Amino acid sequence: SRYRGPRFKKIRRLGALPGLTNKRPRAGSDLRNQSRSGKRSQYRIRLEEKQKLRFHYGITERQLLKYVRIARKAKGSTGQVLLQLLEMRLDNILFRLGMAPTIPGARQLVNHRHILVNGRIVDIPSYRCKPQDTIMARDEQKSIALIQNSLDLSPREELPKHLTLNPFPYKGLVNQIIDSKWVGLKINELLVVEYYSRQ
């Protein structure tokens, strides 16, 4: 699905989901009740690291089991490799290049078939990019400057070291797989990895 839903709920519960669904911080007129008082079971903590990951990328949870099985299946730090297989997801890159303000914005911006990759169109948000790729607009998007609106309001945050945004010819490419320091979201890999040990 998309979850397509009320989302300041998820920001108040999970903590501030960075970039995804807002640059606006939560509870501009809210939070004036509901003392937590400090009781939270540890399973709630690991569950909130699931959904801190799952809402921040908009994944289906069954697909997140799929990415964990591939992450175990690869060789190396599974806590990091999970955040390589979920960074080189395409609409995360179009978010990170500022081609859309939010990640539902990027997912819808790639559903309606506005992205060529290496000159070929990719209609699917779960496309996993590679090193040395090419990410452009559509030919109609020099007449449909929605991407240029997003690139107009974007450039507070610059880019991490895989990206290379070309200003008017609108091309962004990733030099190499993103480093852990490079990952934008702040979370503990071990907490999430431990949670899926049960399966």
Partner RNA sequence: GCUGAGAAGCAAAAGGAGGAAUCCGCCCGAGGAGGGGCUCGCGUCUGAUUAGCUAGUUGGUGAGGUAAUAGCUUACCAAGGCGAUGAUCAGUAGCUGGUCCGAGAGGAUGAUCAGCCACACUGGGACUGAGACACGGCCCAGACUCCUACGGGAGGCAGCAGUGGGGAAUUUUCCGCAAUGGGCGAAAGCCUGACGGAGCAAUGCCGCGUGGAGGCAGAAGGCCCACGGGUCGUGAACUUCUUUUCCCGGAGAAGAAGCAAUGACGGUAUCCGGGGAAUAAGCAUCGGCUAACUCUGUGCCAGCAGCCGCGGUAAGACAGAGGAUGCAAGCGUUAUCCGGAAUGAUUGGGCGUAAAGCGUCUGUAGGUGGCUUUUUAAGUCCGCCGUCAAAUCCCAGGGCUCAACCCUGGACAG
**Cα–Cα distance, 108 to 27 (Å, whole number):** 26
Q: Is 142 in the site for RNA (CB under 7 A)?
A: no
Q: 89 with 99: CB under 8 angstroms?
A: no
- Size, binding site for RNA by CB under 7 A: 65
* Residue 23 engages RNA in binding (rule: CB under 7 A): yes
Selection from 79, 85, 95, 83 nearest residue 195 by Cα: 79
Q: Can you tell me which of 35, 38, 62, 169 binds RNA, judged by CB under 7 A?
A: 62
Is residue 121 involved in binding RNA (CB under 7 A)?
A: yes
In the DSSP assignment, the letter for residue 120 is E
Label residues 89-104 b or e (16+ Cβ within 10 Å = b). bbbbbbbbbbbbbbbb
Q: Is 21 in the site for RNA (CB under 7 A)?
A: yes
Output 71 or 163, the one with its CB closest to RNA. Answer: 71
CA distance 148 to 75: 40
Task: Kindly state whether residue 16 participates in binding RNA, applying the rule CB under 7 A.
Answer: no
What is the nearest approach in angstroms of RNA to the Cβ of residue 189? 18
* 108 contributes a contact to RNA by CB under 7 A: yes
CB of 134 to RNA, least distance (A): 13
Please give the DSSP secondary-structure letter assigned to residue 116: E
Confirm or reject binding of residue 102 to RNA (CB under 7 A): yes
Separation CA 137–CA 146 (nearest Å): 10
Interface residues with RNA (CB under 7 A)?
A: 1-10, 13, 21-24, 27-34, 40-41, 43-44, 47-48, 50-51, 54, 60-63, 65-66, 73-75, 100-102, 104-105, 107-109, 111-113, 120-128, 140, 144, 146, 199
